[PDB]
Each structure stands twice: as C-alpha cells, then as structure tokens.
Design a protein around this ligand. Structure first.
Ligand code: NA
Ligand code: NA
Lengths: 261, 275
C-alpha cells in the first residue's frame, strides 16, 4: 500500500517521520523550507493511520518500519538522512535496527528506548479515553494540548497562546482507528540493547520542558548508540520543533553538515 | 469537637454555617485553602509546624466544600465576607493569614475591603488577574463541568499529576506512585460548589487595588506551577507596597504540600518579623 508523500528539492535526501497523529504536513511550516535552503531534498509523508489510511488498524511498529523502508526504496534514496519525532523517532530507531543500510544518519527528537512509566501512564490514559467513547469539549481538549506540548515560557506569552489556540483549529486531530493503533507503535520492551548495535551517526534532541517524553529518556537512547550524542533545547515542550524552530533547525543542520551522505 | 461559624448571607438571601477547626493557644493564624481544598488540607504539613512554633491555627471548610458542597450562586465577595465573619467570630482581628491560590485571592480581596481584620499575610501560588493562558484554563474547566462529561479515571489521575507537581517529582517514578496512591485518599468531587469556586477568581485586573494594601505580605511562587505561574505572583508582590516575592525551586502548583519544609521555613521566618 502506497502512502501519500510530498517530495521537494534536489540533493542529499532527508526523510521526515512525524509523531502519532501528524501528517507529513507537520514538517512544512518550520522544517522543510530551512532544509531546502541548505540544499537538501526533503521527503515527508502520511504514516499509516493518517489521512487516506486513517481507518487502518492492527498494524504494528514493524509494519510502519516496512512502510518507511519501502518509501526509501521506492524513491531510490538509500541511504537517506532521517529526522523523526516521538513515534517517528521510534520508527527511525527500529529502521536502523533491521535495515541500517537505508539510513546514513538521523536526528531523533523527543524519543525513548524502553517502555518507561511515563509512557505506560500515557498509554493507559489515551487507550482509556478512546475506549470510553468520551468526547472532550473543545476548549478542554485545546487546554490539554497546550499543557502537554508547550514550555512554561510559551504559556506566559499572551500573543503566542492566542496563536497556539488559533493553530489548534487549523490542526484538528480526529480520534480514528488509525490514531488508536498508532498508540501501540511504541517500545513494549527495553530496546536500548538492540540500539547498541547501530553504527550510524545520530543526534538525539531532548526538549527541556517535555512532559510526554521527558528529556532524560532521549539521553538514555543517545548513551546506548555508539555514534549517538545528546542535545537539549531549553524552554521547549513536546512540540519543541514547532515552538523553537530556529534552535532546533540550527542543531539539526549543523549536525547533518558535519556528516557524510 | 465540631465547630461552625455563621457564614455571610449569600446573593440568594440564604445564611449557611461553615465548619472550622481551631488548635493551639498562641498567635492566631487563619489558613484559607484553594479551590476544592478542605481545611484539613493544611493539617498534614502546615499545622504541626505552626503549632510547634507557638501559633494557633484556624482551618476551615470554604463555602462549596464538604457540608456545603452543594452551595452555588456565591461570589468572591461572599467568600471574603465568610472569612471576615470567621475572624470577627473568634475575635482575633487583626489576624495573620495564609492563603493558597483561590484562598490567596480571597485573602487579597479581604485585605482590600477590610484591612483591619488582617495584620499580615502569606499568599502562595497567587495572581491578581488572569493572563490569556489562565483565562482559557478557567473557561475550559467551566466547559467540562457544564457539558456533563465525566473524565475517565486514569486520564483524570494523569492530568491531576501533571498539573500539580514539579518536573523533578514527575521524573521520580517512586514519588509518582506515592502521589497517585494519595489521590485516592484525597478525591476531588465534582460538585456545584467546586463549579461555583471556579468564578471566585479575578475577572478584571485587581493589581491596581492591591497598591493600597498596607499590611506586610510574603508572596510565594512555585517555580514549576503552570496553573498559577510564578510571574503572576511576582506581579502581586510588586503591586503591594509592603509585599516581597519568594520563589520555591522544583515546586508545582501544590508546592506547600510537595516541598513543605522550604515553604514552612519561609513562612515562619516572615511571620517572626512582621509589622
Ligand atoms: Na552514545
Ligand atoms: Na512590593
């Protein structure tokens, strides 16, 4: 099954893999233009479970890893640079485990390598929400998204907040069978030992105020990877790449410029 | 013992009784808890330390809590007048006051209309207006209630934990298990009273009014507090001519419960020197 993708520019290819609920579109407001300006070719796409595949259920991390590998193969861009956030970083991580040959280097944002407690609490709360059929009223849904994705410093800034709240109406997230199944595409065991075998250079970025995937969990992924290093962005919540795009793009671009394709 | 005092007449012309607790014989302190908090919230961590320091502690169940959980149609002014009535009934004017969040807001507004009832105050986790983020949070909570929708239990515990505790607590798996077990011993019931307490909050910028408050005040901000961010407490301190600001690191919105030693120390140090 083909997944929608958007292909931009020419040059060294970078494939972006969004987190749970994110269409490939998530990368265009803040990442793609900056990468096109530094000379890369950018590929974004709709993970299984999103848009045209939003009714897909019963798929797994392995399915999604295969979807990603197939995309890289179908476009004849092996090995590609990869940028992943959360579920997307986990997909990248697992891709490097089974097909290290498709990936030259990667940036992994807001990631983790095991089924830690925070993740367990998140799994349960989200699954429960789905299984109850309860609809959160809109302002209450928007307030939770604010509290979970943004830093302290952002909530203090009355202009920004009015944009984030405007931004939420432009970015609806529909409760679908696909979104539910994406919830399972996360570590269920300790994957750190399997990451010890990944040769590729890797930047892990932790966001300082991230409550969904706390920063220290990315440091555990970076420590495991022989060629991994850890970097922390201050004043960024879980949507750090949207909230501090300059700091995060500068970090990724410096790292990708230091490394061979 | 089971003590009650007569609360103020409300806007629907009813007079109700409110439960209170009174312990010790020393210098009187009145504690005003936040939204959803019974007077007993002050007993695990504040009351023993104040009694050991020779203060007398008055705690009580705010209108909308416990036996009045079904109260509705009251306003900030109703709660200010209740708190005045408590003070006048005990004949302890002018009294030291400790408020947190909604309770700090009540203390502030009490100081504005009845300054002779309060000698000095500690205001924790407070504000004198709602910024854009906090106005929205208030509207979201009102909406949840007015919609009838029940939060599933696990989701609800998660949101309570995230909203109230510092990062350093949240990253400590052992402490998280402790707080979560404790949520079950401190259920927060959804009641008409809890809903009405949500409007007992600044509807306008109150900071210019606080500029006329003479009494000495300590304002305590909790560094990781997202429900009442610490810069809003610093604005209150800046408004108050004899107010001073102090920030507790690694403290969420429930900082007096989560870092009781640092908070208690700071309060006792302030009260030993006031006036
Ligand atoms: Na490493
Ligand atoms: Na001042």
């Amino acid at each position: 099954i083909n997944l929608a993708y958007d292909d931009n520019g020419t040059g060294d290819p970078v494939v972006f893999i969004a987190g749970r609920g994110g269409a490939g579109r998530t990368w265009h407001p803040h990442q793609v233009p900056a990468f096109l300006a530094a000379g890369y070719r950018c590929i974004t796409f709709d993970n299984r479970g999103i848009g045209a595949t939003e009714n897909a259920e019963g798929f797994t991390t392995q399915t999604m890893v295969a979807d990603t590998a197939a995309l890289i193969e179908t476009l004849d861009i092996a090995p590609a640079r990869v940028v992943g956030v959360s579920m997307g970083a986990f997909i990248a991580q697992e891709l490097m485990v089974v097909a290290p040959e498709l990936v030259s280097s990667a940036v992994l944002m807001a990631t983790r390598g095991r089924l830690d407690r925070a993740r367990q609490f998140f799994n349960k709360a989200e699954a429960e929400l789905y299984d109850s059929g309860v609809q959160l009223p809109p302002t209450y849904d928007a307030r939770a998204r604010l509290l979970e994705n943004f830093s302290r410093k952002t909530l203090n800034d009355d202009v920004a907040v009015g944009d984030w709240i405007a931004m939420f109406s432009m970015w609806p997230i529909k409760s679908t069978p696909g979104l539910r199944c994406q919830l399972d595409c996360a570590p269920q065991t300790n994957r750190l030992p399997a990451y010890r075998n990944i040769a590729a250079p890797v930047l892990v970025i932790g966001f300082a105020d991230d409550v969904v995937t706390p920063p220290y969990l990315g440091r555990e992924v970076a420590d495991a990877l022989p060629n991994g290093r850890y970097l922390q962005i201050p004043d960024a919540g879980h949507l750090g790449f949207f909230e501090r795009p300059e700091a995060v793009n500068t970090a990724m671009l410096k790292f990708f410029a230091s490394v061979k394709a």
